[PDB]
Amino acid sequence: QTNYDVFEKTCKELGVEYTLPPLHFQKVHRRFLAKKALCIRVYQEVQKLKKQKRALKAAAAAAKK
Amino acid sequence: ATLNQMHRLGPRKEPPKRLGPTEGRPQLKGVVLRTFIRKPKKPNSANRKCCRVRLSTGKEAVCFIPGEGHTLQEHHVVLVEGGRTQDLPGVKLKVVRGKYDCGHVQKK
Amino acid sequence: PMKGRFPIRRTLQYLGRGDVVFKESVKIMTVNYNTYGELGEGARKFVFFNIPQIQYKNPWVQIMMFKNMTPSPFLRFYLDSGEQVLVDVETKSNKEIMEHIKKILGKKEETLREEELEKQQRFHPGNFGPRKYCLRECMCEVEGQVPCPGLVPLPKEMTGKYKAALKAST
Amino acid sequence: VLKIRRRKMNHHKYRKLVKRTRFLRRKVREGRLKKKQIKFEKDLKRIWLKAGLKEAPENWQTPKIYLKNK
Amino acid sequence: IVRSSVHAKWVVGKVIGTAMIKTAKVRATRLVLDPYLLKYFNKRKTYFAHDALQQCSVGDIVLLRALPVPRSKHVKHELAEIIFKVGRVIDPVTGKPCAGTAYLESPLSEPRE
RNA sequence: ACUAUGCUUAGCCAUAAACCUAAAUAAUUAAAUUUAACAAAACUAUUUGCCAGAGAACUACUAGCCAUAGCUUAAAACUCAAAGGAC
RNA sequence: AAAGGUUUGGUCCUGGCCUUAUAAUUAAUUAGAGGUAAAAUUACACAUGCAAACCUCCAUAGACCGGUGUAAAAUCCCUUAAACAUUUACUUAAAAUUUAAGGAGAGGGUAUCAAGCACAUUAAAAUAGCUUAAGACACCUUGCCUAGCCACACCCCCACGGGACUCAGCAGUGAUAAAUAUUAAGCAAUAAACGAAAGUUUGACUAAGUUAUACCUCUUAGGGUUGGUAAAUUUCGUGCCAGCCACCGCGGUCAUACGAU
Ligand code: FES
Ligand SMILES: [K+]
Ligand SMILES: [K+]
Ligand SMILES: [K+]
Ligand SMILES: [K+]
Ligand SMILES: [K+]
Ligand SMILES: [K+]
Ligand SMILES: [Mg+2]
Ligand SMILES: [Mg+2]
Ligand SMILES: [Mg+2]
Ligand SMILES: [Mg+2]
Ligand SMILES: [Mg+2]
Ligand SMILES: [Mg+2]
Ligand SMILES: [Mg+2]
Ligand SMILES: [Mg+2]
Ligand SMILES: [Mg+2]
Ligand SMILES: [Mg+2]
Ligand SMILES: [Mg+2]
Ligand SMILES: [Mg+2]
Ligand SMILES: [Mg+2]
Ligand SMILES: [Mg+2]
Ligand SMILES: [Mg+2]
Ligand SMILES: [Mg+2]
Ligand SMILES: [Mg+2]
Ligand SMILES: [Mg+2]
Ligand SMILES: [Mg+2]
């Protein structure tokens, strides 16, 4: 917050990685970690399907043209 | 509390005003089911005249009958009001003398 | 006992004593001050005593304060045109700071008086209506006018009940 | 004086009551955890079905987190 | 060249996040009067701002200009200026680099570097 | 008389009147302050946590936990006109 | 709050409850008339009558007034933009009235509702982000912003469709409830609709009817209370019985506390 230039050299030379404090504290327990994993997985699957549909839709349009 | 803590909390949280035997109503009408005696808690010593009634709300309550002498019987209709009988525990209703079947105490 | 130091700062009379009413151009006032030092005492007192009064009279101006970011305290105003007015308040008393900002970016007494009169243009004393908006609800309140029938009974001949009876008699 | 005696006497009557009905409480718990697991599974099924998936994500099996896994 | 409808034509805040592409999440604070206590407290608001050059870093004070048309649901401002860079502040009064309440370069000197 | 146990090596449990029954920090000793009393002289400021009659209740339910007769979190109905503290 | 009563063997402290003030509804007892204001158990079901016409045909109106508080944390305040099923001027500019998108700030309860699970940005379509203990999400409750505003209009949030098929217009009825206004008169005034207009219509409204619910002016007097708090008791009966109290309490033979007087 005061001398960024010295900060960068100090971290590079001393080999210390600095991570910024996270804005929000995240609770952790078995129920949360299991639901949070599915929610990420469900989202990815929905987006993967959309990408496939877009390619097929574009491919059909290209053939018509 | 500090001014920052008073700000984050605001005015005191207020428990809601739970209703009593009349359910926040001036009077209720009930049908007598039984007439019995209740014994006041010691040190009081008496045979207080009470009755069970089925109120219009649908619940059943025990009501003290005031006055010297009543003619109430089963299936009679009465107008009950609030007001607890201090010596009688659990008796939170009283019958109104002079309304429906219940009549004014008979001055004799 | 009211909590905090100088609890008079938390009274409506004190908040209303402020005299700095900014021009419509003023949009933001950043306050950069240091918590330790000797030349920044007036700046610290200005944040303690004066910033509440300024915000009270200028509710729509964003006052954001930063601490110990620079060697000296200063004030920077951001105007709607895009201009930035920097003020240096080092070695300056809190009273001096208020007078300086009042001069450069404060509305004059003449302008404020005109706005007050314009605000009250639609209030008329003669208008009748509820007490919240008007002096008198009804003309019966006025002296010499026919009084309200509720307070004073009307003559029988002025009553519809009586007039209807005569028409039937006719 | 009588306030710790009453906590002691109240606490004494709870430990006795728990002892008398210890076996019943065990069967209550095993059933409360089973309902706690079904509620967990159903809540996870609601998520993917609402998102529009017709089957749970590939290679996903709801973890059994309330069973005697430890 | 009509201006935006939003009240916040000009807002100052601190960059609390920069993980979105070309967008910086900024936290502004305003003073709001507590009516019971008659004391001012800080109410903070989040503003998404368009950072075209991705020149923003967490912790730096910035000035945002209201966009004429909202770029998206939440991006209704752009990065007008970086008032203070995080760790790279330049004193407005003297113009010399500073590191807190101290001068990295004395104001008496004239390095012109 | 003798066992679990107290010991060692690995884990687990997370409980005490875990109490100096005193949150931390910087002041001041005069403000004509025994400002109840008793403890430990009093008192100002700052920040956070906590409290709002007693019993019901170190309870019921809820969630988390290697804990499964467990711990932490923690009500209401209902009852009383007191409960409680220091002398 | 100018306070008071009530923990004890006693004192002090702490702390709750209750008393005294003010108002609305209902009930007991009681009551003359007059003027005024208000009218209110119920989004439960409704017999009957009426509540929207006007007018040289076209149109205009019946989108209002009136009613209820259904739903919803629903809102307030403020900004921008555009319209109107409009008006009046110009053939183009001033209003009233709305609509849509927004946001300086403010805006009910439960945190034993602590995570939400797509809620983000970029604009080659990639990045992995968005809200959240400064209270997200979930649930519960409530009309509020009061010259008035908002929502609703038999029910299915809506109303193509369907259904259990219409007074939450005025009056009135059934059921229900502690809760009880006329199945009334007039379009003369004001307001609205229509017409160029004389005019017509209106359960809006106006003038009445009804009711101690309130106020005012008067005239009869009734109601409660009388241990303490807290103004005020004589005789007799009763004898821990009958009864009484808001709190403390009273009654076992001299009861100012119960009943009569
Ligand atoms: S209030 Fe004016 S005549 Fe009644
Ligand atoms: K007794
Ligand atoms: K007291
Ligand atoms: K006591
Ligand atoms: K509806
Ligand atoms: K008329
Ligand atoms: K008497
Ligand atoms: Mg051994
Ligand atoms: Mg000790
Ligand atoms: Mg314990
Ligand atoms: Mg337990
Ligand atoms: Mg438990
Ligand atoms: Mg309780
Ligand atoms: Mg009545
Ligand atoms: Mg209306
Ligand atoms: Mg409702
Ligand atoms: Mg619970
Ligand atoms: Mg109906
Ligand atoms: Mg409908
Ligand atoms: Mg009707
Ligand atoms: Mg109708
Ligand atoms: Mg009535
Ligand atoms: Mg006309
Ligand atoms: Mg006697
Ligand atoms: Mg008495
Ligand atoms: Mg007597």
GROMACS .gro file of N, CA and C (backbone and C1' of nucleotides) and ligand atoms in nm, chain G residues 187-192 201-202 204, ligand 6:
model
   64
  800C        P    1  -8.699   1.487  -0.904
  800C      O5'    2  -8.556   1.432  -0.946
  800C      C5'    3  -8.475   1.501  -1.040
  800C      C4'    4  -8.387   1.604  -0.973
  800C      C3'    5  -8.301   1.687  -1.069
  800C      O3'    6  -8.283   1.818  -1.016
  800C      C1'    7  -8.161   1.569  -0.921
  801A        P    8  -8.368   1.941  -1.073
  801A      O5'    9  -8.311   2.066  -0.993
  801A      C5'   10  -8.377   2.191  -0.994
  801A      C4'   11  -8.341   2.273  -0.873
  801A      C3'   12  -8.193   2.281  -0.840
  801A      O3'   13  -8.125   2.380  -0.916
  801A      C1'   14  -8.313   2.224  -0.645
  802A        P   15  -7.978   2.351  -0.973
  802A      O5'   16  -7.883   2.359  -0.846
  802A      C5'   17  -7.863   2.482  -0.778
  802A      C4'   18  -7.766   2.467  -0.663
  802A      C3'   19  -7.628   2.416  -0.699
  802A      O3'   20  -7.542   2.519  -0.746
  802A      C1'   21  -7.711   2.296  -0.513
  803U        P   22  -7.464   2.503  -0.885
  803U      O5'   23  -7.339   2.412  -0.850
  803U      C5'   24  -7.240   2.455  -0.758
  803U      C4'   25  -7.154   2.341  -0.710
  803U      C3'   26  -7.094   2.251  -0.818
  803U      O3'   27  -6.979   2.306  -0.879
  803U      C1'   28  -7.189   2.117  -0.649
  804A        P   29  -6.933   2.254  -1.024
  804A      O5'   30  -6.911   2.098  -1.006
  804A      C5'   31  -6.792   2.047  -0.947
  804A      C4'   32  -6.785   1.897  -0.958
  804A      C3'   33  -6.801   1.839  -1.098
  804A      O3'   34  -6.683   1.846  -1.175
  804A      C1'   35  -6.940   1.721  -0.950
  805A        P   36  -6.693   1.857  -1.335
  805A      O5'   37  -6.737   1.711  -1.380
  805A      C5'   38  -6.658   1.598  -1.349
  805A      C4'   39  -6.730   1.470  -1.378
  805A      C3'   40  -6.783   1.454  -1.520
  805A      O3'   41  -6.684   1.414  -1.612
  805A      C1'   42  -6.952   1.395  -1.366
  814U        P   43  -8.431   1.343  -1.655
  814U      O5'   44  -8.305   1.249  -1.631
  814U      C5'   45  -8.291   1.127  -1.702
  814U      C4'   46  -8.154   1.068  -1.685
  814U      C3'   47  -8.104   1.054  -1.542
  814U      O3'   48  -8.160   0.944  -1.473
  814U      C1'   49  -7.933   1.143  -1.677
  815U        P   50  -8.195   0.955  -1.317
  815U      O5'   51  -8.056   0.933  -1.244
  815U      C5'   52  -7.982   0.814  -1.264
  815U      C4'   53  -7.839   0.829  -1.218
  815U      C3'   54  -7.819   0.874  -1.074
  815U      O3'   55  -7.836   0.769  -0.980
  815U      C1'   56  -7.676   0.997  -1.215
  817A        P   57  -7.366   0.553  -0.457
  817A      O5'   58  -7.305   0.678  -0.535
  817A      C5'   59  -7.301   0.807  -0.476
  817A      C4'   60  -7.194   0.893  -0.539
  817A      C3'   61  -7.163   1.023  -0.467
  817A      O3'   62  -7.074   1.007  -0.359
  817A      C1'   63  -7.190   1.064  -0.699
  880K        K   64  -7.858   1.841  -0.990
   0.00000   0.00000   0.00000
